[PDB]
């Protein structure tokens, strides 16, 4: 069982140590260890293949070795970059286990303000029994914030438990939402408040 | 040399036979050490190894689903079929076709990731509908168009504007299953309303199970 | 595929004289206008050599003389071929010749001289042969029944593959290739010389050198001698697989050698023009 | 292959460059229990013998002359006067599958004794006692060919190791298999010591106009003296002439009168050593 | 095995007649310099008799 911590984040440019457990007799000698790096939405990239030596495809400052019974990929130079999920992998006596995962993030980012843009549906999906008041929530780095609706009646869910967990090229996770309504009612409602709350800027 | 092509049906029935054809080229299952295999990984969860086809026709299985796990190979067609019998409802995960090039190099090659869901709900038609700006769509200046699609159970869908020509700056972020039981996602491509009527915007929906290539142009619509 | 094809009416074989034949280069030294002598294994001049006839006469009565017997190989042999259609194309050796000693397969049907030092058990009377197909109108090789129990091999010296004509036409002889299959100190020294001839039933007189072809470093025991001739079989001539073979017209003048000193006379260009037997009439001594 | 079915790859007519193999430094061990690791690239043999077998990392010392082992005393033994060499490297890179690679085989239970250089295909069941087998896998009868498993993440003593034996046997046939005879640059118009394949001596290597025969290489003179040879690399005639030598004769008057001398380098143009030729 | 008695395996060149040879420097075999580190092609020149 290659149990890994949830998310050990640190300051950029720091040699934070990633660890997984002893991998006892179920794992014979712990000689074939390969850390992974799975970016959200893409395939994992191999940062190391052996205990110490790394492959020639993604040769970078990703260094690490096993001291006594656990491996730790220490990154010091090329640390201020994108973040992903780490996975230490090894073979057991009869099987191959990947264990848990380490969703290491880059702590420290200047937050200014999110994006609150209302996008009413055009006159194409209304008459098709598919009216939807979509709301775009983006321009915020830390995770996916929770959207709040206070459109003068009550906080209704209406199917917004998505948060769209997918980062863009700028590593900014957008917390967009949608809204399911009645077939045809446009003039009877008002501007649905989509003032999302964000860490640092509640508005 | 890396021509890994992951295929197979996404929406499958409960207790069915899953077929995952992984086509490749270059390296084959002839030199010792080279071994193709599949790795199971649920969306947002960790990874786990299921099958590993080796050069010596060795079908190494995992003890978790040893009774139901089966995989074959084809050296002539360069296609490896993973036959996961008795698809349980919990088996919904994202499979990954890899290649064990050697004992030390643990799964050098990796595929793209094909999401396979298992349920009794049948497939549905798309809901491709443009998102044109309205009179109350001006908040801070961002009034980009959209290709919101809903009313479809198969989760993996891709939106390609102009058949992969206007795909510069696409921010289409997919979503998860809603409370009703239908997925939905819209495009957040960085296209202002200024250069909207002079250029053609056609988001070709790519639905794998239903195989419906619906095309719909985008124009600024009035009230 | 070994079936015995004798079909022979043998007669007491005749013998011919060696008119200054069997002189090669004992080494690779270059000398101009030098009369250096040495103790080598050259062929003595004016000596009775063994003659084997291989002409199939089909006239009034004719004869089917087809001789390929075993010959005691003491130290060497002076091989000649006064052929006109390239009939003789094989040379095999050995001590017992039945899966006991390392044998040879020096033969060239139509491709190249495949010097394969193999240890198969070839059968007692092997023979090659070509067919005159009526559907192709060409002399192609289609018979390679020499060895039966092919075993592992030790040395391969396949030369450049080529294509001959194998035209079994009659008339006057126009080619002569001499060879010396001697072996001393485990070195199968091979000599060769292609000289044109114009004769009917006599050995050509004169002097001719013998340039070395190849020096095989294999050190096997050679105490016998066997030739492999070609059977130009045809469909117009009747017969069966045991008697329907039509031999050509050729003859090889084999001759045993012995230690004998010789007085070589190198030319100004570096070739041996004349030589003295050093054992003939007292004038030569 | 394995120790049970170790094959023999005998190749003749070689130029065996063992220097690049000794300078490779990629294998685990290279120390062989035969001739010294040096000077073996200049001695010439008749032919080379090659084998192929794998043994775990715990018995890599059982391929030495005068050793005992349950794996080596019944699969592959060493000669009493082994003079060749044995090379082995870590095979845990491409021949070790997960769960135990059962491709290779091994045999440890044999009633008879094994002789050096004796490859057997004995597959019949073995009896570990006096009771006959009669074709059963029960008591007092065990199958000799067991599963040679390869755990990919086990100790070093269990990792696979590809072993090859290079026996330098000598026979009565002339020596053919030997390594590189390196050459140097060409020297012209200078008294230098040459190291040709056939001749070794001193002299001046100049050019000439005489042409040798296509098969002839060397060349002598009337009184058995070398005059010109052919360069083995490039087909060309090189006139080999003995460089300038002679005798020094000191012509001096009476020492009571003066003390000056005048040397005379005899039969030399003295451009190679008051000058008056 | 009395390990007090040992002999030298080899050296760079042949020893002169009646000449002492007391050295610890390992033999630099191959082409890569040993730099005083023992390993491949850097065996110890001395070896016990056993
Ligand atoms: C040919 O003759 C030999 C010996 O005379 C004999 O051993 C062999 O069986 C014969 N071949 C046939 C096909 O009879
Ligand atoms: C020897 O040669 C002479 C000259 O041709 C010949 O008359 C004689 O028959 C030959 N004798 C033998 C035994 O070959
Ligand atoms: C000759 O012609 C036949 C057709 O009758 C063909 O099968 C064959 O290949 C040709 N060549 C030879 C060498 O027989
Ligand atoms: C292989 O060659 C050796 C060497 O002469 C010989 O003893 C052995 O019988 C050969 N094996 C076979 C199967 O012909
Ligand atoms: C064969 O030749 C070898 C030398 O290569 C020699 O030792 C041996 O005695 C010879 N045997 C016979 C039967 O001539
Ligand atoms: C020697 O060689 C020269 C080369 O030009 C040639 O002219 C001459 O005829 C030759 N002499 C012979 C072959 O006797
Ligand atoms: C040997 O190599 C040299 C270098 O290219 C070349 O000039 C020469 O012709 C070669 N000799 C041969 C192939 O006999
Ligand atoms: C000595 O060398 C000179 C240099 O040209 C030459 O002219 C002279 O003939 C040489 N001496 C003799 C005796 O050849």
Author numbering:
A (entry chain d): 3 to 205
B (entry chain c): 1 to 223
C (entry chain E): 14 to 298
D (entry chain C): 348 to 620, 641 to 644
E (entry chain A): 447 to 496
Authors' own words:
Structural analyses reveal that XG014 recognizes a conserved epitope outside the ACE2 binding site and completely locks RBD in the non-functional “down” conformation, while its family member XG005 directly competes with ACE2 binding and position the RBD “up”. The RBD region, especially the RBM motif, is responsible for binding to host receptor ACE2, thus containing multiple conformational neutralizing epitopes for blocking ACE2 interaction. ACE2 can only recognize “up” RBDs, which are less stable and favor conversion of S to the post-fusion state. Summarizing, even though XG005 and XG014 belong to the same epitope group, the specific epitope regions towards or away from the RBM region are responsible for their different functional properties of XG005 and XG014, even though they share partially common epitopes.
To further understand their structural difference, we determined the cryo-EM structure of the SARS-CoV-2 S trimer complexed with XG005 Fab to an overall 3.8 Å resolution. Similar to XG014, XG005 bound all three RBDs. In contrast to the XG014 structure, however, most XG005-bound S particles exhibited two “up” RBDs and one “down” RBD conformation. The binding of the XG005 Fab molecules with the RBD domain buried ~813 Å2 of surface area, with the heavy chain and light chain contributing 480 and 333 Å2, respectively. The XG005-RBD interaction focused on two loop regions of RBD (L437-450 and L498-502), with the latter overlapping with the RBM. The tight contacts primarily result from extensive hydrophilic interactions. Intensive hydrogen bonds and salt bridges were formed between CDR-H2, CDR-L1 on XG005 and N450, K444, V445, G447, V440, N439, T500 and N501 of RBD. As predicted based on the competition assay, the RBD epitope of XG005 shares common residues with the RBD epitope of XG014, mostly located at the one-loop region (L437-450), and overlaps with the ACE2 binding site. Structural modeling revealed that XG005 binding requires the opening of at least two RBDs, suggesting that XG005 induces the SARS-CoV-2 S conformational equilibrium toward opened RBDs. In contrast, XG014 induces all RBDs to the closed conformation, thereby locking S trimer at a stable prefusion state and limiting its conformational change, which is essential for receptor attachment, viral entry and membrane fusion. This helps explain why XG005 promotes S protein-mediated membrane fusion, while XG014 did not.
